[PDB]
Structure formats: C-alpha cells, structure tokens
Amino acid sequence: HSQGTFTSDYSKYLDSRRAQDFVQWLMNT
Amino acid sequence: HSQGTFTSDYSKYLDSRRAQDFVQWLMNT
Amino acid sequence: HSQGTFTSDYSKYLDSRRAQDFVQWLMNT
Amino acid sequence: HSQGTFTSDYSKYLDSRRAQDFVQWLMNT
Amino acid sequence: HSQGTFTSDYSKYLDSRRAQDFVQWLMNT
Amino acid sequence: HSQGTFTSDYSKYLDSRRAQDFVQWLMNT
Amino acid sequence: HSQGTFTSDYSKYLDSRRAQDFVQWLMNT
Amino acid sequence: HSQGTFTSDYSKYLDSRRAQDFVQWLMNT
Amino acid sequence: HSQGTFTSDYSKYLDSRRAQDFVQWLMNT
Amino acid sequence: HSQGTFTSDYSKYLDSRRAQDFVQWLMNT
Amino acid sequence: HSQGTFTSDYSKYLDSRRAQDFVQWLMNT
Amino acid sequence: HSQGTFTSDYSKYLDSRRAQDFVQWLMNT
Amino acid sequence: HSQGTFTSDYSKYLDSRRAQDFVQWLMNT
Amino acid sequence: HSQGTFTSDYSKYLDSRRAQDFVQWLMNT
Amino acid sequence: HSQGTFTSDYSKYLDSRRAQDFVQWLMNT
Amino acid sequence: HSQGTFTSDYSKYLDSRRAQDFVQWLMNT
Amino acid sequence: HSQGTFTSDYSKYLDSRRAQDFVQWLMNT
Amino acid sequence: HSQGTFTSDYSKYLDSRRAQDFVQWLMNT
Amino acid sequence: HSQGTFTSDYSKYLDSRRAQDFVQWLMNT
Amino acid sequence: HSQGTFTSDYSKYLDSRRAQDFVQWLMNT
Amino acid sequence: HSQGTFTSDYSKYLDSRRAQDFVQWLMNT
Amino acid sequence: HSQGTFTSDYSKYLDSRRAQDFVQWLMNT
Q1: How far is B28 from chain A (nearest CA, A)?
Q2: Taking the alpha carbons of D26, N8, M26, B11 in that order, is the dihedral positive or negative?
Q3: Closest Cα partner for N9 from R24, D29, P29?
Q4: Do L17 and M17 touch (CB under 8 A)?
Q5: CB-CB under 8 Å, A19 with H18
C-alpha cells in the first residue's frame, strides 16, 4: 500500500437527482 | 498492493437521473 | 497485486437516465 | 496477479438510457 | 494470473438505448 | 493463466438499440 | 492456459439493432 | 501507506437533490 | 502514513437538498 | 491449452440488423 | 489442445440482415 | 472570441534562472 | 474564434536554466 | 477557426537545461 | 479550419538537456 | 481544412539529450 | 484537405540520445 | 486530398541512439 | 489523391541504433 | 491517384542495428 | 493510377542487423 | 496503371543478417 490510493463511494438514491457542477481552468507559462 | 489503486463504487437509483458536469483545461508551455 | 489496479462498479437503475459530461484538454510543449 | 488489472461492471436497466459523454485532447511536443 | 487482465461485464436492458460517446486525440512528437 | 487475458460479456436486449461511438487518433514521430 | 486468451459473448435481441462505431488511426515513424 | 491517500464517502438520500457548484480559475505566468 | 492524506465524510439526508456554492479566482504574474 | 485461444459467440436476432463499423490504419517505418 | 484454436459461432436470424464492415491497412518498412 | 481566453508570454533571459514556487491545497466537503 | 483559445510563447535562453515548481491538490466530495 | 485552438512555441537554448516541474491531483466524488 | 487545432514548435539546442516533468491524476466517480 | 489538425515540429540537437517525462491517470465511473 | 491531418517532423542529431517517456491510463465505465 | 493524411519525417543521426518509450491503456465498457 | 495517404521517411545512420518502444492496449465492450 | 497510397522509405546504415518494438492489442465486442 | 498503391524501399547495410519486432491482435465479434 | 500496384526493393548487404519478425492474428465473427 506504499503508493496505494484507495477510493470507496457507496451511493443509494430514491427518486433523486445528482448535479455535480465543476468549472476548472489551469494554464501555466 | 505496493502500486495498487483500488476503486469501488456501488450505485442504485429508483426513478433517478445523474448529471456529473466537468470542464477541465490544462496547457503547460 | 504489486501493480494491481482493481476497479469494481455495480449499477442498477429503474426508469433512469445517466448523463456523465466530461470536457478535458491537455497540450504540453 | 502481479500486473493483474481486474475490472468488473454489472449493469441492469429497466426502460433506461445511458449517455456517457467524453471529450479528450492530448498533444505533447 | 501474473499478467492476467480479467474483464467481466453483465448487461440486461428492457426497452433501452446505450450511447457511449468517446472522442480521443493523442499525437506525440 | 500467466499471460491469460479473459474477457466475458453477457448481452440481452428487448426492443433495444446499442450505439458505441469511438474516435481515436495516435501518431508518434 | 499459459498464453490462453478466452473470449465469451452471449447475444440475444428481440426487434433490435446494434451499431458499434469505431474509428482508429495509428502511424509510427 | 507512505504515499497512501485514502478517501471514503458514504451517501444515502431519500427524495433528495445534490447541487455542488464549483468555479475555479488558476493562470500562473 | 508519512504523506498520508485521509479524508472521511458520512452523509445521510431524508427529504433534503445540498447547495455548496464556491467561487474562486487565482492569477499570479 | 498452452497456446489455446478459445472464442465462443452465440447469436439470436428476431427482425434485427447488425452494423459493426470498423476503420483501422497502421503503418510503421 | 496445446496449439488448439477452438472457434464456435451459432447464428439464427428471422427476417434479418447482417452488415459486418471492416477496413484494415498494414504496411511495415 | 465569445469564450476566447487569449494568453501571450514573451521570454528572453541571458545567463538567468527562473524559480516559480507555488503551493496550493483545496479540499471542499 | 468563438471558442478559440490562442496561446503563444516565445523562448530564448543563453546559458540558462528554467525551474517552474507547481504543487496542486483538489479533492471535492 | 470557430473551435480553433492555436498553440505556437519557439524554443532556442545554448548550453541550457529546462526543468518544468508539475504536480496535479483531482478526484471528484 | 472550423475544428482546426494547429500546433507548431521549433526546437534547436546546442549541448543541451530537456527535462519536462509532469504528474497528473484524475478520477471522477 | 474544416477538421484539419496540422502539427509541425522541427528538431536539431548537437551533443544533446531529450527527456520528456509524462504521467497521466484518468478513470471515470 | 477537409479531413486532412498533415504531420511533418524533421530530425537531425549529432552524438545525441532521445528519451520520450509517456505513461497513459484511461478506463471509462 | 479531401481525406488525405500526409506524414513526412526526415531522420539523420551520427553515432546516435533513439529511445521512444510509450505506454498506453484504453478499456471502455 | 481524394483518399490518398502519402507517407515518406528518409533514414541514414552511421554507427547508430534505433529503439522505438510502443505498448498499446484497446478493448471496447 | 484517387485511392493512391504512396509509401517511400530510403535506408542506409553503416555498422548499425534497427530495433522497432511494437505491441498492439485490439478486441471489440 | 486510380487505385495504384506504389511502394519503394532502397536498403544498403554494411556489417548490419535489422530487427523489426511486431505483435498485432485483432478479434471483432 | 488503373489498378497497378508497383513494388520495388533494392537490397545489398556485406556480412549482414536480416530478421523481420511479424506476428498477426485476425478472427472476425
């Protein structure tokens, strides 16, 4: 697990709507 | 598991709608 | 499992619609 | 399983529509 | 299973439509 | 199974249409 | 099964149409 | 776990709507 | 755990709506 | 089965049309 | 079965049309 | 130019060294 | 040029060394 | 040029070394 | 040039070494 | 040139070494 | 030239070594 | 030249070694 | 030249070694 | 030359060794 | 020359060894 | 020359060995 990146998500929705809104800008000169 | 990257997602929706909205920009000079 | 990359997703939808919206730009000079 | 890459997906939809929308650009000079 | 790459997908749709939309560009100089 | 690459897909559709749309470009100089 | 590459697909459609659309370009110099 | 980055999220919603709204801009010259 | 970044969130909502509103701007010359 | 490459496909369509569309280009110099 | 390459396909269509469209180009210098 | 993001940088150094040092952390729950 | 993103950089160094050092972390739950 | 993304870089170094160092992490749940 | 993406780089080094170092991670659930 | 993607690179090195180092990870669920 | 993708690279090295190092991973579910 | 894809590379090395190192993985479900 | 794909490479090495190293994997389900 | 695919390569090596190393896998279901 | 596919290669090696190494797999179901 | 496919190769080796190594597999169902 030295470089291990463990991700766990459990999702349960009844009559539901998910709206994840993400704007990202990254310019390096 | 030295470089192991474990990802687990469990999904269950009844009459549902998922809207993941992602904008990403990355220019490096 | 030294370089193992385990991915598990379980999906179950009743009368549902999935909309994963992803925009990605990556130019390196 | 030293280089093993295990992927498992279980899908079940009743009267459903899937819309995975992915835009990717990658030019390296 | 040292280089084993196991992929399993189970699909079942009733009156359904699948739309996987993927755009990929990769030029390296 | 040292270099084994096992792929299993089970498909069952009633009155359904599948639209897998893939664009890929890869030129290396 | 040392170099075995096992592929299994089971297909059953009632009044259905399959549209797998794949564009691939790969030139290496 | 020397470089381990463990993330765990458990989600359960009944008749719910999630609205994560994120605007990010980062240009460095 | 020398560079470990552990994040844990547990979420449970009954008839609820989440509105995380974030505006961020960062330009360095 | 040391170099065995086993492929099995079972197909059954009622009033159906299959359209597998594949474009591939590969020139190496 | 050391070099055995077993292929099995079962086909049954009622009022159906099959259109497998394949373009392949491979020149190596 | 409605969504146009124009970036121009002109750089000329004689016997010079550039050290842009940036640390950024952003976790939202 | 409605979505045009024009980037121009001109670089000329005599006996020079460039050190652009960037650390970025962004996890949203 | 409606979606045109024009990038131009001109590089000329005499006895020089370039060190662009970029660390980026982005996980959205 | 409606979707045109023009990239031009001109490179000339005398007794030089280029070290472009890029680390990128992007998992969306 | 409606979908034209023109890329031009001119390279000339005397006693030189090029080290383009790129790490990219992108899993979407 | 409506779908034309023109790529031109000119390379000339005296006593030189080229090391283009690229790692890419892309799994979409 | 409507679908023309013109590629030109000119290579000349004196006492030189070329090392183009490319790792690519792309599985879509 | 409507579908013409013209490729030209000119190669000349004195006491030289070429090492083009390419790994590609592409499974679509 | 409507479907013409012209390929020209000129090769000349003195005391040289060529090592073009290509691994490609492409299974579509 | 409407469907003409002209290929020309000129080869001359003094005390040389050629090693073109190509692995290709393509199964479509 | 409407369907003409002209191929010309000129080969001359002094104390040389040629090793063209090609593996190809193509099964379509």
Answers
A1: 5
A2: negative
A3: D29
A4: yes
A5: yes
